[PDB]
Amino acid sequence: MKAVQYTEIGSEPVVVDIPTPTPGPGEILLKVTAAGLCYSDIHVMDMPAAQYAFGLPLTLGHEGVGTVAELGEGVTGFGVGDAVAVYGPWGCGACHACARGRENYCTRAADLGITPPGLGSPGSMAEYMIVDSARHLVPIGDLDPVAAAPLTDAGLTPYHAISRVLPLLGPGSTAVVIGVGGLGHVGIQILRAVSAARVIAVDLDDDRLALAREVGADAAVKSGAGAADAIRELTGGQGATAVFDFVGAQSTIDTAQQVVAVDGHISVVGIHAGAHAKVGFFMIPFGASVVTPFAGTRSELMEVVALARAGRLDIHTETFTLDEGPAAYRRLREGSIRGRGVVVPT
Template identity: 80%
Template sequence: MRALQYTAVGSEPVVVEIPTPAPGPGEILLKVIAAGLCHSDIFVMDQPEDSYGYGLPLTLGHEGVGTVAELGAGVSGISIGDAVAVYGPWGCGTCHACTLGRENYCTRAAELAIAPPGLGAPGSMAEYMIVDSVRHLVPIGDLDPVRAAPLTDAGLTPYHAVQRVLPLLGPGSTAVVVGVGGLGHVAIQILRAITATRIVAVDLDDERLALARSVGADDAVRSDAGAADAVRALTNGLGATVVFDFVGAQSTIDMAQQVVAIDGHISIVGIHAGAHAKVGFFLVPFGASVVTPYWGTRSELMEVVALAHDGKLDIHTETFGLDEGPTAYRRLREGTILGRGVVVPG
């Protein structure tokens, strides 16, 4: 089979021919229909050799949707041909967090060398992939696979971030979404679907700000030197109840700390090496909290899929063939993909 792999530190990914894997006991072989690109992949490929820890060669892709092609011994509860999405943050399945479905916060994954697909284990940028357990598959029914693949991260991650602070987002509140990319444009739709908050989108790009308005943002602010003042003005000087930073650069984290309200909340979702928040008295408003949520729970992925079935989520995608994968990652790095890039191996 063909796969898109990262083969050497500092190199671009390449399409290679590798053996089609066979499922072992408890495992499932998935025929991949669609696989999403993510800035986390760029983060992985930008790691220097002395800190890279994801294994080589690495088949990329942690957003995957496909059909069940083969079942390993002992697998039940799923059938050949079923259309499913892959829940990515694999855990041990037995610790307290995992038994609650919160495998994204598994306490033993590192100890047991359990890695997510595309972030240590072979991922979904291939014609086939192995899924380690039936509990990591969520049925998608008749959803479009291309639009469903990003639900597993670009949908699940913002949904989890919003759910953590849902009680704060009632009438009269303001949520600021920084970065209207693959995750940010979905976050706006999630906020519109399950909260009563006012939504302010912040981005550098006019096309993305237009996208933000089209999917439900009440206001759109250019991310420049005047952005913090503009957000403050929109909130009558009170600041934002919640800031969701889907960029995670030092400049956006600093802006989040400038605009968050007293007793507000900052959720740093985007990852940039070296960027950090400075927390302490007089560094953030009194009562404000700062968190770094990670991915989401299995039950939350089911809820995201349900929102998509109800027509509440319209994932903007640009598709690429597997051979176009290297070009797609270059486009992702350049910031020229509107919404989410999705590779279709077939």
């Protein structure tokens, strides 16, 4: 089968021919119908040799949707042909976090050698992929696979981040979304669907601010030195109830701290090495909590899929073939994908 793999440290990923895998006991083989590109793949491929720990080669893609092609021995709960999304952040399934579906916060996974697809195990950027267990598949019914693939991370991650503080986001609240890319453009829509928050989007790029308004942002602010003051002018001086920072650069985190309300929240979702919030007296408002959330829970993925099925999420995508996978990663690097890149095999 055809796959896109990271094969050499510091090199672009390549299209390869590798064996179609066979599912062992408990496993499911999917025919991949769509595989999302996430900017985290760029972080992974930019790691120096000393830090990179996912093994080579690595079939990329941790945003996967497919149809069940083959059931491993003992698997029930799915039939051949069933359309499914892959729950990405695999946990041990047994610990207290996993018992609540919070496999994203499993502390046993590392020691047990459990790695996610596209991030230590073979990913979805291939004609076929293996899933370890039935509990990591969520049915999507007749959802368009191209728009469904991003739900598994571009949807799941903002959904989880928002869910952690949803009780704060009542009528009269304001939520700031910083970074209107793959995650952020879905984040805006989740906020509109599950809360009555007023949504202010922030981006460097005017076309991304246009995208923000297209997907339901109430206001759009240019990122940079003026952003904090502009956001404060929009919130009447009180600041924003919650800031969801999908960039996570020091400058955006600083913006977030300068605008968050007393008893509000900053969610640092975007990853920029070294960047951090400074949470201490006189540096942040009283009661304003800060967290770096990770991925999301099993039930949260189901909820994201339910939003999509109800017509609440307009996922902006551009489609690529497997052959175009490396080109798509170059596009993601340069910031020229308006929303989420999605590879559609064959």
